[PDB]
Design a protein around this ligand. Structure first.
Ligand SMILES: [Ca+2]
Ligand SMILES: [Ca+2]
Ligand SMILES: [Ca+2]
Ligand SMILES: [Ca+2]
Lengths: 19, 142
């Protein structure tokens, strides 16, 4: 869970502000 | 509860290079640069100042948390998944490996033992081919 999720809350936040 | 608090703090600390609680455009760019392509300042500011609730121009912890924890405006939740997928899959074939995993986590800044890598991919992978496809990813990242 926790190492995927930290990255996932992370990477989505890149995706959304960019795209 | 707190479990989400921890998980969003770990997420924040993934960004936050220097640990004051404010992710700057510098830090944000350093992140991007680390991944591959590298925007300029102006373009990392457009990102920041969208979320920004005070008007100080660094994204703070209750601003990080209110962006991720609540729902969106439009249908963009579909597009976060996509783009999460396209950050992971370096090739763009549809399938994430153990190495692509390692690459992104390098880039963000985790120094994994190969146990943790295995423990991670084996929790993603449903079937047993050892690659994460889109349906396995949706099941993971809701
Ligand atoms: Ca900082
Ligand atoms: Ca702020
Ligand atoms: Ca691939
Ligand atoms: Ca699989």
């Amino acid at each position: 869970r926790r190492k995927w999720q930290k990255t996932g809350h992370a990477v989505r936040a890149i995706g959304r502000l960019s795209s | 509860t707190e479990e989400q608090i921890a998980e969003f703090k770990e997420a924040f600390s993934l960004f936050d290079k220097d640990g004051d609680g404010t992710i700057t455009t510098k830090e944000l760019g350093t992140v991007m640069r680390s991944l591959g392509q590298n925007p300029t300042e102006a373009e990392l500011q457009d990102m920041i100042n969208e979320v920004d609730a005070d008007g100080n121009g660094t994204i703070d912890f209750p601003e990080f948390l209110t962006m991720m924890a609540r729902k969106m405006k439009d249908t963009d939740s579909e597009e976060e998944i996509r783009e999460a997928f396209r950050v992971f899959d370096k090739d763009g074939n549809g399938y994430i490996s153990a190495a692509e995993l390692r690459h992104v986590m390098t880039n963000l800044g985790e120094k994994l033992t190969d146990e943790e890598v295995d423990e991670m991919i084996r929790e993603a992978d449903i079937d047993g081919d050892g690659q994460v496809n889109y349906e396995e990813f949706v099941q993971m990242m809701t």
